[PDB]
């Protein structure tokens, strides 16, 4: 199966540079273009360019000359995009994508995106607090429990439950910007109340810019 695996989230000083990577697998890397795309929620989708890993040829969107530079390492089936001269306006999510066409049947594959935050502020890792289940978070035999992921910079955190084994009933809310300029976020899940004594619920919080990993067990009280 084809997979494009992109590098973690970045915090970069204004004017500086950062190298994003896109690791390909499951197919012959040298036979298809890697395309790169920018998405800014405040503007939309933009195509940056393509690179063909067989011969290293490229086609850039004129707007990104001197901002982006595409390269590939065929030895490790990895594409790269060097981002340089970033302004605070350049904060964005960057996607890599490839498409395989066989007998004119086409299938696209995308990386999961890399968030780049361009700011002079220093990074801060989150504090993770349990949202304990109790009589005040039950309804019709279901129980709500969660984690509060508080005081971090920049976005994003990734939150999972039980290393990904728990996904049904999860709501991970959009983060809010506090007066301090730090972000805070809630992740909640609804589970059966009957099984609170035998099941374990752990929110896994990961924040790449501060290399912070927390596994927080959420117990009833």
């Amino acid at each position: 199966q084809v997979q494009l695996q992109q590098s973690g989230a970045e915090l970069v000083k204004p004017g500086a540079s950062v190298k994003l990577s896109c690791k390909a697998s499951g197919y012959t890397f040298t036979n298809y273009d890697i395309n790169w795309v920018r998405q800014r929620p405040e503007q939309g989708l933009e195509w940056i360019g393509w690179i063909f890993p067989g011969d290293g040829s490229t086609k850039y969107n004129e707007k990104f000359k001197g901002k982006a530079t595409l390269t590939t390492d065929k030895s490790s089936s990895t594409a790269y995009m060097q981002l340089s001269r970033l302004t605070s306006e350049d904060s964005a999510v960057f996607f890599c994508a490839t498409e395989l066409v066989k007998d004119y049947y086409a299938m696209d594959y995308w990386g999961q995106g890399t968030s780049v935050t361009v700011s002079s502020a220093s990074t801060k890792g989150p504090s993770v607090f349990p949202l304990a289940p109790s009589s005040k978070s039950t309804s019709g035999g279901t129980a709500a429990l969660g984690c509060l992921v508080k005081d971090y910079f920049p976005e994003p955190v990734t939150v999972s439950w039980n290393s990904g084994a728990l996904t049904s009933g999860v709501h991970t809310f959009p983060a809010v910007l506090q007066s301090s300029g730090l972000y805070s976020l809630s992740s909640v899940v609804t589970v059966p109340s009957s099984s609170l004594g035998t099941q374990t619920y752990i929110c896994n919080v990961n924040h790449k810019p501060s290399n912070t990993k927390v596994d927080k067990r959420v117990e009833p009280k």
Binding site: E99, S139, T190
Partner: protein, 213 residues
Amino acid sequence: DIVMTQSQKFMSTSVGDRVSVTCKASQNVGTNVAWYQQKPGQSPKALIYSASYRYSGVPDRFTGSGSGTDFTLTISNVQSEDLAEYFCQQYNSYPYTFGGGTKLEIKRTVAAPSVFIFPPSDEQLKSGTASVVCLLNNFYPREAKVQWKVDNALQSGNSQESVTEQDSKDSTYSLSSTLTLSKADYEKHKVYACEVTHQGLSSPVTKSFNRGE
């Protein structure tokens, strides 16, 4: 300067109905338009290529169409899974360009929020600060008003809230609100409550707890 424009920024439809988004192209592009679906936090996924036929595994609900400069994506028998932002794109000539995006909203029956409240953890209190969380789970429509009351005094300026995207399975929303106080102020008061008003509620719902449990 080369551009692709979708007139509808937002579209609204019920489950089971047909809907279509218009994309106009500034120059002749012929077959070489693509359509994409994107859900919040996820990568785009291509639906249509050659302006007229679908990527492998895309269901027959999605039919693209157009001739030269006028293009439409049509979704028949719309499903709650189809909730997404939709983009057109031209790949005929460089630089490649996308449309501005059309968000699909699902109309459904009213659904009242299940309301839950969480006191601060002891670990947070040791850090000198106290957050109370009020959770409104799977409700519709999106409009809901949450009021924090401490010892029955209406609070303002000390809370923040956020709402989910519309749910892909039941087309509801959920809302989280956090009231944030210092430990010292938290200990000055006894009763912490969040009061919810919503169209599905005939009367406001209050969830509350007494500090010290």
